[PDB]
Amino acid sequence: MVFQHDIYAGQQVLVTGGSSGIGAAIAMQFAELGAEVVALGLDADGVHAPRHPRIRREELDITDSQRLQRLFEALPRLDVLVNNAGISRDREEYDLATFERVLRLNLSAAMLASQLARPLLAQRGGSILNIASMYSTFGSADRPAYSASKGAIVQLTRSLACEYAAERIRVNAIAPGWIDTDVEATRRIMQRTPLARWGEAPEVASAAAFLCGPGASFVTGAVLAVDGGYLCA
Amino acid sequence: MVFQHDIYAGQQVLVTGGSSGIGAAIAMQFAELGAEVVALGLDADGVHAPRHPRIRREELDITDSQRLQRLFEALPRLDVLVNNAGISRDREEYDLATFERVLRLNLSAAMLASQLARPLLAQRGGSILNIASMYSTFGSADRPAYSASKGAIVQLTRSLACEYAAERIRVNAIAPGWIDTPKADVEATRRIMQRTPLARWGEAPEVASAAAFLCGPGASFVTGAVLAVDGGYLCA
Amino acid sequence: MVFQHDIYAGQQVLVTGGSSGIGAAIAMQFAELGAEVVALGLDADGVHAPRHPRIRREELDITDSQRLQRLFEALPRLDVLVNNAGISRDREEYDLATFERVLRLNLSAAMLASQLARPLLAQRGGSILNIASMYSTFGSADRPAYSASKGAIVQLTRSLACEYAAERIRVNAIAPGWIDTPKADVEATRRIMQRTPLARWGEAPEVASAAAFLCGPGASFVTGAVLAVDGGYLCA
Amino acid sequence: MVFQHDIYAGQQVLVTGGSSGIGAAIAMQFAELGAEVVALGLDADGVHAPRHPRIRREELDITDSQRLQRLFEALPRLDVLVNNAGISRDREEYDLATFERVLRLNLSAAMLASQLARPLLAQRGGSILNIASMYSTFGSADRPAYSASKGAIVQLTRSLACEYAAERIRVNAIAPGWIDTDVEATRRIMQRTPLARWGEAPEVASAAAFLCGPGASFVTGAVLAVDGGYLCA
Ligand SMILES: NC(=O)c1ccc[n+]([C@@H]2O[C@H](COP(=O)([O-])OP(=O)(O)OC[C@H]3O[C@@H](n4cnc5c(N)ncnc54)[C@H](O)[C@@H]3O)[C@@H](O)[C@H]2O)c1
Ligand SMILES: NC(=O)c1ccc[n+]([C@@H]2O[C@H](COP(=O)([O-])OP(=O)(O)OC[C@H]3O[C@@H](n4cnc5c(N)ncnc54)[C@H](O)[C@@H]3O)[C@@H](O)[C@H]2O)c1
């Protein structure tokens, strides 16, 4: 409907957390537009993992730094990196070990992946897309580590945008709203969302396809809200 | 070479400030993608005005409220409104009458256009795109009215996003960085370039491509948003 | 019981919208701390107007530009300007004339007052304090002109902070949350309270204490800033 | 000049990174207004450490979680916690171990300190003050971990503001500009600062004394810029 069929033909994309939810939809969207895609994640062949002849599914815990490095070293080419893998442990995040676990996946692994991707992305130029959150803006009483990590990922986006510009690598983020991947909480969220519905994973994916392509040639360091207006209400 | 050719086939777009610069490029981008476009502005047939068989060029000062209303009433259909018209009078903006002139075009005319567009946009749903500025974020000593007006246009974007959502009218903004629209100030260029990670001027079609995305079906869950198209300027 | 009694002894403060609510509390707070204060507003001697021997109450519609200028010209001295006057007409703000009325008071009058104050504030340095809003951040479907005006006042704050810094005039804003100024809407109260971490209305003197800090020598490196005094509302 | 002499009389304050720079000035400011203060940091008796009869100087690496916990357990009372300790390793932050070191001190230790302080602060109510940065807003090519950590600390501030409100604990941050604690870089910074000078440590301290006191009773989740206008230019 929106993009020309082969706009990423001949390109290589790697999506962390590609094995379900938003990552799976992003992987599918790039594959559908001609890219070869590596969908990295846990339970890489599970029910929610994306099936497509141009998507290779790979089981990998990206906090395993050495294993991640080997994977990147084996890649002959990379045009786009999507740092999508993210977790929350809700109120268990008040436990320090758990807080640190959440940061390590949500932030530190994204930093490492970006640095491992960097020499490949510099070959022809390319892009990085990080996934932020409403909690990059609002605080969360129930998930302090998640909120902290998402504030961090926005500043990492802006910092790597500055650093990688000279290598023609653009670095952006999407801040999704409540994406369908407690009656009272649902009602609260829906009342505060102008569009009054859940966001859908493919809607984040369509934004990803735009931000990582040549129509966004002057876009770097940006955070695009894909949230049905939630931030505004 | 990003979008399918007919995304906007059968649709009607109206771009204020369509007679030069960013507005002209936005008008051309929508026309390219199949839309009929009305390009409203001053000097509507000037050298910088967009030429295309699907672009109607119309001379209209949009601060003329009655004339603007008549134009909108004559439209049988409208799918997208782009509130792009904007001016600055630099340090003359310290004069109150001039300050108010800048606000009247940059903000009040955008409010009026949005309200005149609303019943048409509500028919099938549609979108509004406002043009913000780096000065929606940073202050400007040399153009206080411009900066004020662009902070206003961002809150207007968010407010109308809330109001118009129930009519399926999405309302977003682009905050362009420094776009080469007809710079001779060597020192200013150097200052801007030092603060722009991509180290160049933006081009009007680069703003236009973002407009084509935000106003289309790939942005169905995007409303109230401000997208920076600025080469990283906000980050440095 | 926070500030020393004479921090503003020998100084002159002018508060627009000083005749009720937040403005009245700000005027009282500066008067408490030794300042002579002019409280400008409508119904200047009404029930909500601040009574104090160091507060002169003056009836003045600040959209009357010539009258405002005469008042400022009569002042022998000015150290602090508080642009607090603000109005909303809720959904009547969809009417353009009303939209412009709200902008004219909330933004343009603040610009004029700032410029009239400027030569006096430049004598020894001094400060300007603007009053923003939660709707400088969030949009408001029910008051688009109010929200637009408050986004504008934040960018005006930042712009004049840049412009006036070389004259040692600091320019800041407070963004108050929901302040109990004379609520009967049970549903609205419940919505606001659910989103306020401190789970209560703010009180006018609580905004006033922040004003006393921002405009004083403990805030010597604070300019262009917006301080939220909102019980956490922006965070929830 | 600004505050009444005994406004924090009888109260207990703990400042992390209290042994130099901004932390030292904050410690002095609270002590001068009547508080008993623990100034925790490295080189706790060094030249820059604050000397005052109401300031106890304590040598403690706050990444030593067990030692920090013991210190908090020994406190009979706490009214204000200032999470001021912060580091940067500049471009060495591109090394993952170093990136993680910076996060661990700048963010995780602040989370732990806040949680250890929480039961004491809940006794009578009280406040937490975190120290943010210009790089909570702007990215930094030369210090990505620092910028990430400071984006994180702003979201942690907002998250703990939401969580701790019911216990009458207010949680705020100051975003200092360039504080005097490369000719070309100096010139750039000074040209972009409207007040055209360095900020001074006591100027951050005066803001701290306001935010943690009863004149800021309705202020929580706030970030106050103390930056000479830098953010605006
Ligand atoms: N769902 C929402 O409403 C929402 C809102 C805002 C932001 N986000 C962000 O979107 C991203 C994806 O979330 P989702 O909603 O699709 O969740 P999800 O749980 O459906 O998917 C998470 C993905 O991350 C992967 N993952 C987790 N730990 C991993 C590890 N150690 N190594 C490798 N992969 C790992 C999972 O295997 C999975 O593929 C996250 O960063 C999340 O914070 C989601
Ligand atoms: N050029 C930049 O770098 C830049 C950066 C950020 C934002 N912007 C914004 O982009 C928008 C377009 O600016 P541009 O750079 O293309 O400038 P431009 O001067 O080339 O375009 C101005 C357009 O607005 C029209 N206009 C002016 N007054 C009008 C009136 N009274 N009635 C109707 N139309 C009127 C003009 O005729 C013209 O078509 C403005 O809103 C501007 O603030 C521009």
Ligand SMILES: NC(=O)c1ccc[n+]([C@@H]2O[C@H](COP(=O)([O-])OP(=O)(O)OC[C@H]3O[C@@H](n4cnc5c(N)ncnc54)[C@H](O)[C@@H]3O)[C@@H](O)[C@H]2O)c1
């Ligand atoms: N009440 C809140 O919860 C709240 C929240 C955020 C911001 N604010 C802002 O605080 C400020 C004060 O509002 P308030 O709640 O105290 O309201 P209020 O209605 O009690 O005060 C309005 C004041 O402005 C004056 N005013 C109105 N029109 C004027 C004119 N033409 N000329 C001169 N003075 C005029 C009034 O006479 C009065 O003194 C406003 O800027 C408002 O937007 C209020």
Ligand SMILES: NC(=O)c1ccc[n+]([C@@H]2O[C@H](COP(=O)([O-])OP(=O)(O)OC[C@H]3O[C@@H](n4cnc5c(N)ncnc54)[C@H](O)[C@@H]3O)[C@@H](O)[C@H]2O)c1
């Ligand atoms: N100086 C500036 O311009 C500036 C600007 C913005 C933010 N900040 C922030 O202000 C805070 C203080 O910085 P400063 O400029 O005073 O720096 P500084 O180096 O003078 O002081 C840092 C303090 O943190 C302590 N510290 C470091 N590692 C520690 C550990 N493991 N355990 C305990 N204490 C430790 C040090 O011993 C010292 O007391 C930091 O959070 C910094 O990011 C400073």
